[PDB]
Amino acid sequence: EIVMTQSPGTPSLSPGERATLSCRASQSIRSTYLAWYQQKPGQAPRLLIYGASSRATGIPDRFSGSGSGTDFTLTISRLEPEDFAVYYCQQYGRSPSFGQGTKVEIKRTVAAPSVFIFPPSDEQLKSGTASVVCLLNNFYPREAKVQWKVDNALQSGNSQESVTEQDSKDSTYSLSSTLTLSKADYEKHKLYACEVTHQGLSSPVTKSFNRGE
Amino acid sequence: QGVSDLVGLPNQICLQKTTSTILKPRLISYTLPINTREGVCITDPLLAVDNGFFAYSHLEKIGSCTRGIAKQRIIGVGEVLDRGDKVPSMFMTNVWTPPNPSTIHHCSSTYHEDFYYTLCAVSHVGDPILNSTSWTESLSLIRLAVRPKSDSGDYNQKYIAITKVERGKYDKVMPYGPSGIKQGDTLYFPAVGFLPRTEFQYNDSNCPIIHCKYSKAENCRLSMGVNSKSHYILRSGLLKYNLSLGGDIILQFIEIADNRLTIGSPSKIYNSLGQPVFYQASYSWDTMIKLGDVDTVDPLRVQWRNNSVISRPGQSQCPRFNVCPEVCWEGTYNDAFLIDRLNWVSAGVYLNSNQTAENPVFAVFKDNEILYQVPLAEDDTNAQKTITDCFLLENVIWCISLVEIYDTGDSVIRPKLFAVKIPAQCSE
Amino acid sequence: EVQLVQSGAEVKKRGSSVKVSCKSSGGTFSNYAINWVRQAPGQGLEWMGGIIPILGIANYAQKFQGRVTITTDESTSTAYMELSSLRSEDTAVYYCARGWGREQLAPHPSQYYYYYYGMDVWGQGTTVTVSSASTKGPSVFPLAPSGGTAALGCLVKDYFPEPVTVSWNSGALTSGVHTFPAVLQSSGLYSLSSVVTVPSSSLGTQTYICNVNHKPSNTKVDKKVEPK
Ligand SMILES: *[C@@H]1O[C@H](CO[C@@H]2O[C@@H](C)[C@@H](O)[C@@H](O)[C@@H]2O)[C@@H](O[C@@H]2O[C@H](CO)[C@@H](O[C@@H]3O[C@H](CO)[C@@H](O)[C@H](O[C@H]4O[C@H](CO)[C@@H](O)[C@H](O)[C@@H]4O)[C@@H]3O)[C@H](O)[C@H]2NC(C)=O)[C@H](O[C@@H]2O[C@@H](C)[C@@H](O)[C@@H](O)[C@@H]2O)[C@H]1NC(C)=O
Ligand SMILES: *[C@@H]1O[C@H](CO)[C@@H](O[C@@H]2O[C@H](CO)[C@@H](O)[C@H](O)[C@H]2NC(C)=O)[C@H](O)[C@H]1NC(C)=O
Ligand SMILES: *[C@@H]1O[C@H](CO)[C@@H](O[C@@H]2O[C@H](CO)[C@@H](O)[C@H](O)[C@H]2NC(C)=O)[C@H](O)[C@H]1NC(C)=O
Ligand SMILES: *[C@@H]1O[C@H](CO)[C@@H](O[C@@H]2O[C@H](CO)[C@@H](O)[C@H](O)[C@H]2NC(C)=O)[C@H](O)[C@H]1NC(C)=O
Ligand SMILES: *[C@@H]1O[C@H](CO)[C@@H](O)[C@H](O)[C@H]1NC(C)=O
């Protein structure tokens, strides 16, 4: 019944910088029962630190752990590229439990998205449902907002999203939004618009098509 | 000389509180037959030392200590002698091994001239404490010679089924504690009696709930059993065994008086500076250490010390230093040995933790202050039971302590043995 | 080195049970502990319980007490986790992992405690999906292009279960491709997109075909994407 809370939510650092992650316990624990793990996408976690300061075997020097009682800290003295991953803290013993995780991300300059709108394919309208897609391509940072307009009527609950991980070459993100209609309701409207807001965008950018032209 | 009972005028000890390490333990665990092997627990340990001899017992299981398969029970005796280093040590002379180790429970050793008499319970239902109704009272005595002889028949080792038990109003009685004493030719073993809740005489008004806002007057009585609705309550006392009687073998139960009554628990009666002292484990809400001079042996009444510094770890409901009546069965056995009656200085091992069994600390203490102490292990060291007996070696007060510890060197729960000289001077 | 090899992916109906296995492959369990740790997609790690096979004993997080059983076959050096009364909340990757485990003296006359230490050897994980939907291959729809740089794509919609694979021009086209994580829609079906960024003049010369493979239904669809 111990809770671990982790900080910061998502720091952005550069290769060669120093990362320091924090883990806070809902109640005091002996140092000997704290561990730190690393996880890259599509892989299992691997142990980095245990006993709150002891490096696991095979783990580079740049990883070090410290703290006591309620507060513990994991330090990467100087980041390498493969260090950009998710880090979990854990308390163990009678009923172990994890922190919620901290993702370390590559920092670069703000980059505005490119925006593309995709009307539904006729072949899908034949089947009775209609999807309209919005692509936000190669932006940074991760936070972007997609407002769907139909004749300037904004909706909710009918549009899903997805985001790629950081690009290995340029360190950007891309996002895809899918607004889903019944063919019936698609037939009933003319102007379909995507409105995108992002830190590299003072004025929101909008891309829209008029149905059937 | 050699090693003698702590009696007469022994060598002076620092009587003042100091934080500097003037106690240095000596490990003597290699002298007892604890043969480590991966995946075998060693539990139910027993230690007694009287008049330069000693008794020891353990049960080693394969796997867990609770649900492990009982592999071997051993009861042994020997002499406590000088290593050559003017340091006392155990040397086995005689060891007995029952044919079925899972059948023997709650052994207790009392020394008398040529032997250690070890009284044990026999059970086919497991621990009688946890299976009280199903246990048919059955007791054994293993008599072991401390100095075996060549062609002696049963002088070396004699087993005895007990067949006559006088137990008063109690349904069943059982040995409950590591060691007892002798008075003349009579032996006294620490013991417990099982009495049905229905016939337990107790006025709830005697429960001291007064400065405890969340304590109900029913709590003491409910805590006289290992749970609130248990069929029995448990009452500490002695099993008396008069050897002068001869013939066949009568054990008589003596209940403990109800001054500062707590649930029946593993206890020890020992002799120090020529008169008997009693320790009782705190297995309930009354968590400060329960020990003191015995006032009368029959009936049994202890002059409990008003000790405000030594306690024992508990769980969430009766943790260390708890003083208010609660309904709980929890705690550990950590006895102490009086080493100076005029100042009431004792030596013992306590677990320095609130709700965890760890950090064994050997400490010399009066009623209201710990004079000097020293750890016996690192600060996360799992450790539960401690038995401390003290004696003279060429008139220097020494104490030997058994501690059930988790040994990281072998990754195994097992007992360890320490010798500690009580220093005369108070500096470095 | 040891290796923990876990059982294969599972698709289970709402309300059923599942029994993942984990085999030790290169050393036995000797006195270590086997933990089970789950991870919902996008979410974090969550310790479910553990077993110490050289002792009898197994212990569980309170949240899973009752629904989770953890056992071993010590002879074949294998551990099992059985989760019953499954729901959508249990859709997750379930990992098996080894560490120190230890019995501990408790401050109690009879009780003992059980400590599970850090986990240094991990299995590859078992995906288990709890859904009522049935195996179904996707439909692929073009995302028509419409200088200086253009974007085109393929919508891979209404399939089950995971996964889908997408390539472009049989794998010859890789630069500028973004294949997005699948989304799960309220029909219980999955849907994802794959897009590619190309030169705007490149829309005249070259052709672009996306190759969608869905193994649970033996489905292969190549779809060309035209500027309409
Ligand atoms: C292990 O347990 C010890 C005992 O806990 C108490 O008993 C148990 C049964 C339970 O009831 C707990 O709730 C109790 O706290 C802990 O030591 C005790 O700590 C308390 C509070 O920290 C001490 O008390 C103080 O007593 C002093 C008397 O001289 C007063 O100065 C003081 O009064 C002030 O504070 C109270 C609120 O606490 C308010 O009324 C006012 O602020 C008032 O002015 C307290 O009453 C008590 O003396 C301690 N008992 C001991 C040492 O035997 C112990 O906690 C540790 O020990 C103390 C000394 C501090 O160092 C704590 O910070 C420390 O945590 C537990 N140990 C651990 C590791 O948790
Ligand atoms: C407590 O004692 C009971 C009473 O005998 C034990 O129950 C018996 O156990 C043996 C061995 O398992 C069986 O052969 C008997 O049939 C059981 N009797 C009944 C009435 O069920 C029980 O095993 C003991 N429990 C513990 C935890 O020690
Ligand atoms: C132990 O047994 C002996 C012998 O039975 C007891 O000694 C007898 O005590 C009674 C009453 O005190 C005397 O009348 C007898 O004369 C004694 N007989 C002998 C042979 O000495 C002794 O009192 C018993 N001790 C205890 C503690 O019970
Ligand atoms: C511990 O303290 C208690 C209470 O102060 C003492 O108990 C009293 O002792 C007197 C004798 O001095 C008896 O007449 C009373 O019946 C006892 N109870 C009371 C007064 O409530 C006890 O003697 C002290 N023990 C030690 C070893 O100091
Ligand atoms: C219980 O204690 C109170 C207080 O002295 C007393 O009045 C009452 O008679 C007692 N009851 C019994 C049965 O002794």
Residue numbers in the entry:
A (entry chain C): 1 to 213
B (entry chain B): 176 to 603
C (entry chain D): 1 to 146, 152 to 233
What do the authors report?
There is one 1∶1 complex per asymmetric unit in both crystal forms. The overall structures in the two crystal forms are very similar and the region containing the HeV-G molecules and the complementarity determining region-3 of the heavy chain (CDR-H3) of the Fabs can be superimposed with an r.m.s.d of 0.3 Å for 386 Cα atoms, while the two Fab structures, excluding just CDR-H3, can be superimposed with an r.m.s.d of 0.6 Å for 185 Cα atoms. The difference in the two structures is in the angle between CDR-H3 and the rest of the Fab, which consequentially causes a slight difference in the buried m102.3/HeV-G interface area: 1070 Å2 in crystal form I222, and 1010 Å2 in crystal form P6122. However, most interface residues in the core region are the same in both crystal forms. The heterotetrameric m102.3/HeV-G assembly is generated by a two-fold crystallographic symmetry axis in which the two Fab molecules contact each other burying approximately 770 Å2 surface area on each side, while the two HeV-G molecules remain separate.
To fully characterize the binding epitope, as well as the binding and recognition mechanism, we determined and here present the crystal structure of the complex between the globular head domain of HeV-G and the Fab domain of m102.3, a close derivative of m102.4, featuring an identical heavy chain and a similar light chain. The structure reported here of the HeV-G/m102.3 complex reveals the molecular mechanism underling the exceptional cross-reactivity and neutralizing potency of these antibodies.
